[PDB]
Amino acid sequence: PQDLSEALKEATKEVHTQAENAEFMRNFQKGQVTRDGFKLVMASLYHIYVALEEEIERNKESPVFAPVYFPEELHRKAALEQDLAFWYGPRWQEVIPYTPAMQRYVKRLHEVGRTEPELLVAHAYTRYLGDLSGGQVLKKIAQKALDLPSSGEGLAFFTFPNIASATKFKQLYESRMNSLEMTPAVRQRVIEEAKTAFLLNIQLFEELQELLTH
Numbered sequence: 403p404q405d406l407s408e409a410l411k412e413a414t415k416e417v418h419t420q421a422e423n424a425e426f427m428r429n430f431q432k433g434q435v436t437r438d439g440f441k442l443v444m445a446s447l448y449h450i451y452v453a454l455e456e457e458i459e460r461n462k463e464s465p466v467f468a469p470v471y472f473p474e475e476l477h478r479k480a481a482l483e484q485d486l487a488f489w490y491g492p493r494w495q496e497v498i499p500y501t502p503a504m505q506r507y508v509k510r511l512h513e514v515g516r517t518e519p520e521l522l523v524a525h526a527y528t529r530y531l532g533d534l535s536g537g538q539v540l541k542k543i544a545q546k547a548l549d550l551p552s553s554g555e556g557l558a559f560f561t562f563p564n565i566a567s568a569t570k571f572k573q574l575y576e577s578r579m580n581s582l583e584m585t586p587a588v589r590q591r592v593i594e595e596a597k598t599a600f601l602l603n604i605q606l607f608e609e610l611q612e613l614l615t616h
């Protein structure tokens with residue numbers, strides 16, 4: 403494939419379907435999701451985005467990332483902080499779980515962000531773009547199966563307020579990725595890192611499913 407974005411999308415088709423097939427994600431799609439299962443996914447997201455956005459801020463000016471740096475449009479941490487306060491309460495920071503599978507994901511993120519900056523774009527792509535184009539469908543489901551009250555909170559994560567049009571921003575971000583110059587070596591590694599990203603989510607889904615079936 404010519405474009406890195408077109409290359410990524412095609413190289414991760416397999417793992418993505420694999421992601422959709424995961425037991426946890428299947429039940430989620432089959433409208434089957436519990437408050438406890440949803441809390442774990444939000445807790446996970448908070449840990450993942452904290453680490454990811456921590457590393458993006460460290461490589462904000464680097465030529466290997468600057469092109470896809472859109473902090474106001476994409477930051478999710480603040481939104482998740484708001485959400486976890488609703489799901490876990492005022493003391494959420496003390497009680498939210500931080501599991502081994504979440505730590506594995508968080509660890510690879512810090513590693514790439516500290517010793518392989520040129521691969522960070524692979525994680526920002528997988529997370530941000532994935533949650534943006536598939537966000538609505540994923541939220542639509544959850545909010546029905548959750549039948550939560552109407553306190554006006556708990557799902558801020560699924561809404562990117564600083565993005566007027568998801569499609570127009572998607573194409574813009576892709577454009578910026580395709581503008582990134584890299585050796586075929588690096589490019590191949592970025593492609594790999596994206597596949598790796600999907601595997602870190604899949605094993606995470608496996609673990610969460612395990613924790614909820616005792």
Ligand code: HEM
Nearest residue numbers: 407411421422427527528529531532533535536539600603
């Ligand atoms: C379990 C089922 C999931 C559903 C139902 C779902 C749904 C969606 C939808 C509706 C799209 C739109 C098609 C497109 O953008 O090309 C999409 C794209 C994508 N998803 Fe998923 N997704 C799931 C899980 C995940 C996971 C675990 C990740 C990884 C964090 C992920 C990463 C992506 C990426 C990166 C794209 C955009 C690729 C591109 O077009 O360049 N998705 N997803």
